[PDB]
Amino acid sequence: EDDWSKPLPPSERLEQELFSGKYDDIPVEATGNNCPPHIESFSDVEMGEIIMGNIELTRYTRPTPVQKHAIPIIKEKRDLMACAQTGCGKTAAFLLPILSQIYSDGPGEALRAMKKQYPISLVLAPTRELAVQIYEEARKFSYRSRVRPCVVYGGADIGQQIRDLERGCHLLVATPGRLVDMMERGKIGLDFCKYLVLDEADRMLDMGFEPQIRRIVEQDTMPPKGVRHTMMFSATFPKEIQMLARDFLDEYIFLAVGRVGSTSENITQKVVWVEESDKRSFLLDLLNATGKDSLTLVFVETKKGADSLEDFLYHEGYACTSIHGDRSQRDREEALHQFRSGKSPILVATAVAARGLDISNVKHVINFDLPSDIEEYVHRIGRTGRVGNLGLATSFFNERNINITKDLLDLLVEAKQEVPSWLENMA
Ligand SMILES: *CCC(=O)NP(=O)(O)OC[C@H]1O[C@@H](n2cnc3c(N)ncnc32)[C@H](O)[C@@H]1O
């Protein structure tokens, strides 16, 4: 056999690519059954030489707020549910303890008795942006060790990632759509996946990734809850998340960084009454007031509506593309790149045709048409806003939306947003 706790020979050729290169502290509310209290320094918990050596190389000093509490929790083989939007070091909060256990316990007898890749740990992410950030920090801490990480994501060459996987992966970072695609090709097996991490689970649900995430976790060879160690990270906490955290976690601990609640902030919501005849006019005025290069996403409810609306905006001179299924994958994936960088800063789309597509973080979401469920509305307006700047979500309301009047109202009050006075007088 072999050993996975002794650092391998270094290579000065490799330090160059990895270590070439912030707030303070904020309140925590760690509610859990019999959880271990946090730590103050990395030297407190004996994580391992391969980790400690790599910690120095990136000039890591003190563990961040979430890293103080989450790190001792994970290495104690306890499921975690961390809800923290204004928390720095959310990604390294799980990488250090997970990799510390893999270096200690080893890969397990199943892998060493072998010579389709079976990764030990799996990290799910919503965006290609966040997937690579986790992957590049994984490389930073898997250096000088026998763990090789791999990343896959949608909207890229699948053949080059397959060639990357076959080179051997133990810690895989993936978006849910591309991971399911790898599994159907017999390239990835979750049989020996011990550590599961769902990073930014809220934004993963807003993009329509749940059927994949449940296909990955609940409908394959993924070891069951209790056998695997599962962590979750998210900013919001709707009914969708707590139900998901109930199915995916076994007797977990809840972490909180100050402001913790459903309906992410940094998103200003405006609701206006617009009859169907005036939606075109109202949208035009809404676009004439738009910033110079502010990216805008316009949801509609049908395929015919999305085509007719995109035709409207093009005949008015606005640079806009569309995605609505009736245009094949050659035009849809082209619309992303055209929208991801100027060119067509107005993307008309439907709720279904945007499922799992990494929209380039829009600045203004416009619900030209409204759905029939308040949970879909949370998904759609979740396409805007980040951990930093403030976003905008305008929604056109009329008599076709009495169904969601009460739910939209209470949602606005919970989000501390302005409430149209007539909306109260409709419930
Ligand atoms: C508030 C910051 C945030 O929201 N996330 P982040 O900026 O992506 O934080 C991770 C980046 O900062 C570096 N990092 C993470 N943790 C530490 C510690 N403890 N010391 C020094 N640097 C840290 C990571 O390298 C990552 O780039």
Numbering used by the authors: 133 to 153, 162 to 255, 264 to 575
Quoted passage from the original study:
Named for their conserved Walker B motif consisting of adjacent aspartate-glutamate-alanine-aspartate (D-E-A-D) residues, DEAD-box proteins are required for all stages of RNA metabolism including transcription, processing and splicing, export, translation and decay. DEAD-box proteins bind nucleotides via the canonical Walker A and B motifs and the family-specific Q-motif that recognizes the adenine of ATP and makes the DEAD-box proteins ATP-specific.
To better understand the binding of AMP-acrylates to ES DEAD-box proteins, we solved the crystal structure of DDX3 (132–607) S228C bound to AMP-acrylamide to 3.0 Å. The overall protein structure is highly similar to the previously published structure of DDX3 bound to AMP, with a root mean squared deviation of 1.265 Å, as expected from its similar thermal stability. AMP-acrylamide can be fit unambiguously to its density and clearly binds cysteine-228 through a covalent bond. The adenine of AMP-acrylamide maintains several hydrogen-bonding interactions with the Q-motif of DDX3 including interactions with glutamine-207 and the backbone of arginine-202, as well as pi-stacking with tyrosine-200. The covalent linkage significantly re-orders the P-loop into a conformation that to our knowledge has not previously been observed in nucleotide-bound structures of DEAD-box proteins. This results in a 9.4 Å shift in the side chain of T226 as compared to AMP-bound DDX3. In addition, the phosphoramidate of AMP-acrylamide is also displaced more than 3 Å out of the phosphate-binding pocket as compared to the phosphate of AMP so that only the 5′-oxygen hydrogen bonds with the P-loop backbone, whereas the phosphate of AMP typically makes numerous electrostatic interactions. Interestingly, this distortion of the P-loop breaks the electrostatic interactions between the phosphate and the P-loop backbone, which are typically thought to drive nucleotide affinity. Nonetheless, we expect the reordering of the P-loop observed upon binding of this compound to strongly antagonize the closed (active) conformation of DDX3.
